[PDB]
Design a protein around this nucleic acid. Structure first.
Lengths: 99, 118, 119, 45, 116, 217
RNA sequence: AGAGUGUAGCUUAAAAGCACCCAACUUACACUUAGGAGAUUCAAUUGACGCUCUGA
């Protein structure tokens, strides 16, 4: 059924007069630009460590696959064989305070 | 009746079975750059062009670039797009570094060498 | 009086000119060329050159484009080339750096509209 | 790296104020959840 | 022309691909269409994690046919997002599953359920 | 050549407690809250706090504060569970609650004759046994407890071949869902290590390279 | 211990071009625009500082 809840509520139309004021200072926006600079650097670095870890563990797993090929001729057919128990696979996200 | 191509036919190396896994032209500008690159290259067919045709200086430049970018005022003027560049110094340092190359380009285009020195 | 390549209606850019001003915006550098219709380069002006490079904070912004536009303007003012063609694609035609570049070229002294051929 | 998709903002434009109330369902686990009427703690019976 | 050596120099429809069970024959063993359900009480966290997993998908050559969502439910409200993923290796399935496990910001649930 | 068939397992503990935030991340937390307030549009609470106070002032010239006070005192009522059960213990390596913001890896000392090695938990497998079945048997046999974990696939993660009779060691990767870890003070030497102490515990080249397929995050 | 060696992720590039990241439109992706960080491992073609493989 094509019903979606991305339609904006009708109540957000009339009383839009609480904050018409948007005024900052030059030092504040200089800090904003410096923060955007350093965060682009920082999360680019974060993705750099992410891609380094994934390339390291990909090359570890493909080296693992070629070693299992060269040391076991009857185990690679069942090693690449997938497991059917991942159909109802779920994982809850992290929390703050343990029970 | 067909005849085989004389040289290497374009768009031949990329034609495979699965183009869906290949990454993509998401834009237009990249194709314009690559097509200009291919149009610059010579070919075997008939084309429009056929009928109608050290370390110390680098270290000093890196140090100057690091010192110029370390100024708070230059970055503040750059982020506010109000910075300007003096034309006199740039003109003089063009007259120093790479002026002969551009003057040779003008002497090539303005029909000077084929009439003076063959 | 001289002939212009009047065709190429179905392909970009139009070749009906005598001098083309092309701007290449790379990841690192912005570059400007003043060229013939034969493909011969005539006047070049790059941020890949120490003279304009050390006087700029970053080689790609509005400031770098305006400065290299002023430099190319004075270069072609003294080079005796007074009329160009500048054809931007409509997405970066409305861009701020290219509007600033066109304004700097109009203020420099080079008109970016070439006079008509006399038939 | 459980903080990449937590430094967020409302991608819409017609939205009201949201406040990070700490929510607990039944097990004493607090989650910062953006909601109106700026409560501080929640507990579902 | 057909007889000249320059025949088909402008041919392009073979470069144009303009036109579900899992493909598991004997050696190349792949998932079909999947559905990843992201359930959270925050829409900011929900579509932010959806953007993050989609940016992970298009940077790793993963086919994503749709990135739609389902409407919320009255209870507190629950915002749920659907990310469809097709085409993986078994090693690659292990890797993408461990990344989507270890990338959860705050209380977001996962699902590796398939179509229907 | 006689191959000494050996498999193993790399157990992983998912982070129940999220990682602490950088102060720079705190700066974008405050900044994103500020810009969300600046780009919001007249929430009902501020309509019931500003205009109601203006009407009260108009009436006096001729409650949101109580709600905020009771919210503050109810926040002060329920004390938050401590995220740090880590520094107060500082020596409970066998316990599952040694760390909360990082992954935890099972790791067992093993007594051999020609060797004496602190190893990732291993086992011996037969050609008739499945490697996934070997890992399940290792989980159900070695710790002598009641975890319920979850694997991802039969694909491996790291193989290392050391000889003195050929030999090979197989490295998978598991993931604990939950577990009844009865009698936590076992006679074994299982120690949970986030990332660093592995380099303190596992010296040789067949064991100092385990961390390159362990999720460091 | 020996061999292969070496420009940011990639280059039969010579300090470049493709890559990469946020900010804005997009449910989202993508485009575009605004910005950003980048390197020839150190000494005189050669030696030694870093990585991979082959040994114990």
């Amino acid at each position: 059924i094509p019903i979606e809840d991305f339609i904006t509520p009708l109540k957000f139309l009339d009383k839009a007069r609480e904050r018409p004021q948007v005024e900052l200072t030059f030092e504040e926006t200089e800090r904003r630009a410096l923060l955007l600079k350093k965060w682009s650097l920082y999360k680019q670095q974060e993705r750099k460590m992410e891609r380094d870890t994934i390339r390291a563990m990909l090359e570890a797993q493909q080296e693992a696959l070629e070693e299992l090929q060269l040391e076991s001729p009857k185990l690679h057919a069942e090693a690449i064989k997938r497991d059917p128990n991942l159909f109802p696979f779920e994982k809850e996200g992290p929390h703050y305070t343990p029970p | 009746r067909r005849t085989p191509p004389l040289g290497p036919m374009p768009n031949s190396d990329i034609d495979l079975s699965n183009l869906e896994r290949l990454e993509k032209y998401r834009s237009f500008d990249r194709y314009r750059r690559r097509a200009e690159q291919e149009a610059q290259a010579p070919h075997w067919w008939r084309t429009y062009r056929e009928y109608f045709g050290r370390t110390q200086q680098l270290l000093e430049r890196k140090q100057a670039i690091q010192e110029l970018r370390a100024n708070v005022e230059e970055e503040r003027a750059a982020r506010l797009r109000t910075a300007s560049v003096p034309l006199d110094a740039v003109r003089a340092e063009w007259e120093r570094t790479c002026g002969p190359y551009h003057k040779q380009r003008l002497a090539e285009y303005y029909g000077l060498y084929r009439d003076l020195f063959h | 009086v001289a002939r212009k390549e009047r065709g190429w209606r179905t392909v970009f850019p139009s070749r009906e000119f005598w001098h083309r001003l092309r701007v290449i915006r790379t990841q690192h550098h912005v570059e400007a060329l003043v060229e013939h219709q034969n493909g011969k380069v005539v006047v070049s002006a790059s941020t890949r050159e120490w003279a304009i490079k050390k006087h700029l904070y970053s080689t790609r912004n509005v400031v770098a484009c305006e400065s290299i536009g002023r430099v190319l303007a004075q270069r072609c003012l003294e080079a005796g080339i007074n009329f160009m063609v500048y054809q931007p694609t409509p997405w970066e035609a409305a861009s701020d750096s290219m509007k600033r570049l066109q304004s700097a070229m109009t203020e420099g002294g080079v008109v970016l509209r070439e006079p008509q051929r006399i038939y | 790296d459980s903080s990449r998709a937590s430094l967020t903002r409302v991608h819409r434009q017609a939205y009201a104020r949201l406040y990070p109330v700490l929510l607990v369902k039944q097990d004493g686990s607090t989650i910062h959840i953006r909601y109106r009427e700026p409560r501080r703690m929640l507990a579902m019976p | 022309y057909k007889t000249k050596p320059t025949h088909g120099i402008g041919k392009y429809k073979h470069l144009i691909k303009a036109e579900v069970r899992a493909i598991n024959l004997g050696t190349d063993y792949e998932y079909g269409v999947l559905n990843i359900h992201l359930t959270a009480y925050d829409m900011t966290l929900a579509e932010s994690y959806a953007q993050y997993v989609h940016n992970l998908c298009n940077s790793l050559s993963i086919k994503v046919e749709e990135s739609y969502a389902m409407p919320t439910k009255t209870i507190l409200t629950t915002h749920e997002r659907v990310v469809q993923i097709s085409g993986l290796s078994a090693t690659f399935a292990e890797i993408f599953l461990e990344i989507i496990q270890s990338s959860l910001p705050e209380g977001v649930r996962l699902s590796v359920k398939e179509h229907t | 050549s006689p191959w000494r068939l050996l498999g193993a397992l790399c157990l992983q503990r998912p982070p129940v407690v999220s990682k602490p935030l950088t102060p720079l991340q705190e700066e974008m937390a405050s900044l994103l809250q500020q810009i969300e307030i600046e780009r919001s549009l007249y929430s009902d609470h501020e309509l019931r706090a500003l205009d109601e106070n203006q009407r009260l002032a108009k009436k006096k010239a001729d409650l949101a504060q109580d709600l905020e006070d009771m919210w503050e005192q109810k926040f002060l009522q329920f004390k938050l569970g401590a995220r740090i059960t880590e520094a107060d213990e500082k020596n409970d390596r066998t316990s599952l609650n040694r760390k909360l913001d990082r992954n935890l890896v099972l790791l067992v000392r093993e007594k051999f004759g020609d060797q004496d090695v602190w190893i990732l938990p291993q086992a011996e497998w037969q050609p008739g046994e499945t490697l996934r079945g070997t890992a399940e048997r290792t989980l159900a046999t070695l710790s002598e407890n009641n975890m319920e974990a979850k694997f991802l696939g039969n694909a491996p993660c790291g193989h290392y071949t050391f000889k003195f009779l050929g030999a090979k060691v197989f490295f998978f990767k598991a993931l604990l869902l939950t577990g009844d870890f009865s009698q936590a003070g076992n006679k074994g030497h299982h120690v949970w290590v986030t990332k660093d102490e592995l380099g303190d515990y596992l010296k040789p080249k067949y064991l100092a390279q385990v961390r390159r397929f362990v999720s460091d995050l």
